[PDB]
Amino acid sequence: EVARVRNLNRIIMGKYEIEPWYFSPYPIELTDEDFIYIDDFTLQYFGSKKQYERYRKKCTLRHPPGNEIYRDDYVSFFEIDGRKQRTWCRNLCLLSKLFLDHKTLYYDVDPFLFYCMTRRDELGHHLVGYFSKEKESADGYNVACILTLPQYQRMGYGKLLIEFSYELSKKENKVGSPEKPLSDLGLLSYRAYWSDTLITLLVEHQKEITIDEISSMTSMTTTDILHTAKTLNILRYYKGQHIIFLNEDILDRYNRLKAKKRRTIDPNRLIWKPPV
């Protein structure tokens, strides 16, 4: 007799069978099986397909449990107060930890707001990703953690999440930046976003733009703007202050960007007021 004591090697979420990148503290018994079921609406975990099915039949809403503060023909965003949806948010944090090297104690969700993005199609809502945000951040971080579910990665969803986080900051009349340190995956996504943003501004708004003007338009911090401008070699001094400027390289990058036919966030569709 050999008694197997297995690690969690796969989660079953709808039709997807996903392998974790890191360990996550699901409060489950270790057994001779190496899978659990994750319900794609409730995020509840189950050791058995039968227990999962039983709960699946129950009458539940088919989208994240919060206020829909943005809705276009491609995506919705739901704003959730961790304190008001403890169970669901804990479940979200356990799922997220499978794909992060480190993360704060999953159980304590009260200090956070969660902004969860769904794609909608003929079958309704499907959660594709989220970012959390501290209700009160000493450092003015506008994102605490950010995740695109692995089955949906590299489809442009992460960039939509980041863009949305800056629309919140703009509505708040504040600059902001993601919490440090960032994973390599996160930092490379932010650098691409920051780069695409400056490039788009230079072609669509004005050929020369000051640091203050960029900050006002984007809610990016001075530090992130300067780092990005130096990487693109577009930092100059004109009319007594620092600017970024348009050149052939930037025009070329812009046209390649547009060629990709990506979706973006429409600021006009954000129906939201800061807490005051």
Next chain:
Amino acid sequence: EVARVRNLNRIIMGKYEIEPWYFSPYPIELTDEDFIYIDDFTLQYFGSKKQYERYRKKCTLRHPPGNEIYRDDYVSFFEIDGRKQRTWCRNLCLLSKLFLDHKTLYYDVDPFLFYCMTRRDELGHHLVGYFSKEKESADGYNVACILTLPQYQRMGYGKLLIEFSYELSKKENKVGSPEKPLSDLGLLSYRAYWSDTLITLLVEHQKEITIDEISSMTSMTTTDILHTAKTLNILRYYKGQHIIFLNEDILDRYNRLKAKKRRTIDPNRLIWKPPV
């Protein structure tokens, strides 16, 4: 010809075949096999079943190599000076690292005492878990690391380990708390222990108890007591100082606790004097 260079994907310990959660620096060659044998008495590791068997036949004690400072009809605890049992303790630390995200250099065991708990039955002693403790802690930490072997997890052993660590502190006439930061699994276990402890005191000892009284009786720190009391909503001011108090919720939690018929540590059976 394909030469496979495998990671350690399973350890064989008695009848158990256990999958690691994290990497551990066993000083072994990488080969086309992905298992090692861990002897459940010596904790020695072997690349081959045959080498393991050879050493298994040798005449060895059948419990951890230290002084038995506690023995009841359910468990024993052995106190081991890392400096006096370097090999065995190094082996214990390698095994433990398989289930921890981080851990101090496994090789340097001299600064630690190890308290190892066995379950005893008709077959003798079986190591189920341990906690280490710094001989000298600047922060007064009463536990450095704590582990229940995975094949024995979720059976109540972790709570026994924690309870024992506080009996040491009480005998020492000191308050103490586990080393921070704690893993999520560790912190949730401590919170349950702290919660069960306050609840039991309120039903069994006195309906209202001051912070000083709790600390004296439990060796819990002021900080851990207050955090726990606020979570349970039982913090008040009475007769000129802060207390915790009994209510219907607490009574209900107590009866559910007792219903579970758990084993506890008997302070009378701890035969031990602090180093002086």
Next chain:
Amino acid sequence: EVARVRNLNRIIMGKYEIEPWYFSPYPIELTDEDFIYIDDFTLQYFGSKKQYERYRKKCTLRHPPGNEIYRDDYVSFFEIDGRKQRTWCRNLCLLSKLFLDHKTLYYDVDPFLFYCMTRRDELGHHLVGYFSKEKESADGYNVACILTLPQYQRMGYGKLLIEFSYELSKKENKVGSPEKPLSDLGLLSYRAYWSDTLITLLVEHQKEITIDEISSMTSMTTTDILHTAKTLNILRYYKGQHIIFLNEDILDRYNRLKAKKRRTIDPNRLIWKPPV
């Protein structure tokens, strides 16, 4: 229909099929397969054997892209400026992260020099390992990261890498030490190197040696020398200063060392000048 979304569970490098120890941010799509190909010359990654083959046929150099600053009948070392070989060095850093718990953002290679060691035989050059080094280190660290590829580990290559790093420091007229914190594997390798070095000096150079003399001869720091001397019990006071001294234990260790017939670095074959 079950859609599998797999983690990277094996890399194929020449004839070797290697299992990663940790996650690494290869910018690849997650699919129903769990392998990638790593070209053993370019370090480029490929999702398909066919794409790999296509690029393999192209005319490339068959050794690392830098200056060969050391060449004996066993190994070569190539010095590479990260800024001058960004692609190759990024690829090296992704490969290395598979075997490290943590590592700086793989993409930013400009601040580093890479010293890459090959073994040469009838088939030419084979990369077996490397160490990186900050062009400018505030702490005077003489190694930033160090790695022997897993298929080549425990063959003595790591010790050659370390020995080479100290020959650079000696040529620079500086003491140095590896960046902290070190992995357990790294620290145990350094301790063995430091120990073998002091033992060899005592038998081959002088029976009693001062701290200054050791530092001058080895580029080891005072701290690493004292730690190593205390571990070996060879620290004394003689003629008004601290020394290490030879004894029977040391002689015995030396003869066992020589018995192993290891290769070493020949300082005479390092053809190199510091940047000035």
